[PDB]
Write an enzyme that holds these catalytic residues in place. Structure first.
Site, PDB file in Angstrom:
ATOM      1  N   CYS A  66       0.853  -1.188   0.000  1.00 48.04           N
ATOM      2  CA  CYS A  66       0.000   0.000   0.000  1.00 48.04           C
ATOM      3  C   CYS A  66       0.895   1.248   0.000  1.00 48.04           C
ATOM      4  O   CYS A  66       2.070   1.155  -0.349  1.00 48.04           O
ATOM      5  CB  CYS A  66      -1.038  -0.033   1.155  1.00 48.04           C
ATOM      6  SG  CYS A  66      -0.492   0.252   2.900  1.00 48.04           S
ATOM      7  N   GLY A  69       2.566   0.315   3.394  1.00 44.68           N
ATOM      8  CA  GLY A  69       2.561  -1.066   3.794  1.00 44.68           C
ATOM      9  C   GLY A  69       2.020  -1.283   5.203  1.00 44.68           C
ATOM     10  O   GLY A  69       1.802  -2.412   5.591  1.00 44.68           O
TER      11      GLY A  69
END
Lengths: 147, 146
Positions: A66, A69
């Site tokens: 993401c 993360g």
């Protein structure tokens, strides 16, 4: 780690094709859990898809990306049988395999660049769980789950 | 973040004195869960002490230190109501507050040096949770807990 379930949100997606290609180059079968575009979407769903696959034994491990993360790895760690490391350097990744038997790795597309991310992946896939003294500690983690 | 539960193992202990001193300098009241020396000890116990404190509303948040911060933060994340970030730079810490409302911060005494660690702590302590679209995502994390 011969087969890996991969997941990402819209922000993590910016690293997807390159990281997937790198994993194929390293000889791992990638099971792709999405996402498949930069269209805004929610990270917990993809965390769930990868985590379920790892916890249910259909896959050896998971990789999640993401923005940082962090959120995606917090979600993954909520599942029983998942031990997820988030990091931005390869030492943490490597030692987490050796000492914590991590089965999920996360990192952030807005934190690490591609080539550092590839090195973190290699360090993670290259490391072996050392058991021994670390086993009682890992067992303590499971105990927290099943309370 | 005015009251913080602190914990570490024997490896995280190498940063304890200066990290605790830095929290106090910034006006944070530290609730020390140990450990208290470099004698070998197991990190899950100190994760539990901090997590139970944060989850039960005894403190505003938790700070955890081991060799890498990863195992201790994985342990903490197994507790209901905990959202724990592990990192080695301030951006991840800051955004985790803003978007994920994290209530525990972890880092590694064998990964980051002291002054970088202080900067990570500062960024985490100074950041506000923004709510909005993020609350839905946070609520989904909690849903997995059930």
């Amino acid at each position: 780690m011969k087969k890996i379930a991969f997941g990402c949100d819209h922000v993590g997606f910016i690293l997807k094709h390159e990281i997937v290609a790198h994993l194929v180059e390293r000889g791992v079968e990638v099971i792709d859990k999405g996402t498949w575009s930069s269209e805004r979407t929610d990270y917990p769903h993809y965390a769930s898809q990868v985590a379920l696959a790892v916890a249910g034994g259909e896959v050896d491990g998971g990789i999640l990306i993401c923005g940082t993360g962090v959120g995606i790895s917090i979600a993954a760690n909520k599942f029983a049988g998942i031990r997820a490391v988030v990091c931005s350097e390869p030492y943490s990744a490597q030692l987490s395999r050796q000492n914590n038997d991590t089965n999920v790795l996360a990192f952030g597309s807005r934190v690490v660049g591609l080539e550092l991310a590839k090195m973190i992946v290699d360090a993670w896939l290259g490391a072996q769980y050392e058991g021994g003294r670390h086993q009682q500690r890992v067992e303590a983690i499971t105990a927290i789950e099943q309370r």
